[PDB]
Structure 1
Amino acid sequence: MSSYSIQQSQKMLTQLQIDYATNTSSNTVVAYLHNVGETTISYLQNSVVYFGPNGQLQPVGYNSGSSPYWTVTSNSLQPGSVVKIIIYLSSPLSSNQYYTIQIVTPNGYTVSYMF
């Protein structure tokens, strides 16, 4: 009598992924966004970014200069490249909670990382 959730038989093509994400201080978060496809992804400033404790993600504004906001090391992402997203937070993260960052490119492509 063996039960398990989802399948490692069941897979789909990945064209974009967050290789790693974590907080670097009490109020800054770093994510490495990796294009493993064959297409350039442009206008990443028009991505939508959400971040928060699990189940309570909040929107994050692009490069507004005032927390919470996010920056990216390049506005476009070529095949095989990585760019670095940073989130500047207004309130400090708690040491005993798990957080999710999620990024939605203009093309709708949706990736997440939990730490």
Structure 2
Amino acid sequence: SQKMLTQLQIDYATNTSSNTVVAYLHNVGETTISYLQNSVVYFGPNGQLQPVGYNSGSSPYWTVTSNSLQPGSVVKIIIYLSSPLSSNQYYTIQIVTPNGYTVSYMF
């Protein structure tokens, strides 16, 4: 019953330099998010997402320094893309955290 009790949100995300995207994941609920590095990440343009492997050695992949997200905390997720972003497409970040909560952000 813990998916309904959870609240997470991506406060902000942007392409910082080269083909790197940074997203700020913020626990705005009252439950701890465990095993953050076991989350599943998808990313892509125009509603067609690609899986992004955790620290997998090949792009696209993502990194995060924390392995848990306490209530109130925010962490920086870094996504290393294989293709440069186009200004004429919209992009979606989709995350499924271990407990099955899903959070997304478009920019």
TM-score (norm 2): 0.90
Matches within 5 A, 1:84-95: 84-95=76-87
Give structure 2 stretches of 5+ with no counterpart: none
CA distance in 2 between partners of 1:64 and 1:94 (Å): 24
1:96, CA displacement in angstroms?
1.4
TM-score (norm 1): 0.84
Alpha-carbon spacing, 1:48–1:10, altered in 2? closer, same or farther (3 Å): closer
Provide Cα deviations, 1:10-68, integer angstroms capped at 9, x if missing partner.
99977110001111124111100000111111101111000000211110000112211
Alpha-carbon spacing, 1:56–1:108, altered in 2? closer, same or farther (3 Å): same
Whether contact under 8 Å (1:26, 1:93) holds in the other structure is no
Percent identical pairs in the alignment equals 100
Give structure 1 stretches of 5+ with no counterpart: 1-8
Specify the SS of the correspondent of 1:91: coil
CA distance in 2 between partners of 1:75 and 1:93 (Å): 28
Q: How many residues are paired up? A: 107
* Aligned mate of 1:14, from 3, 6, 23: 6
Specify the SS of the correspondent of 2:71: coil
Whether contact under 8 Å (2:2, 2:99) holds in the other structure is no
* Runs of 4+ residues deviating >4 angstroms: 9-14
1:73, CA displacement in angstroms?
2.5
Whether contact under 8 Å (2:62, 2:78) holds in the other structure is yes
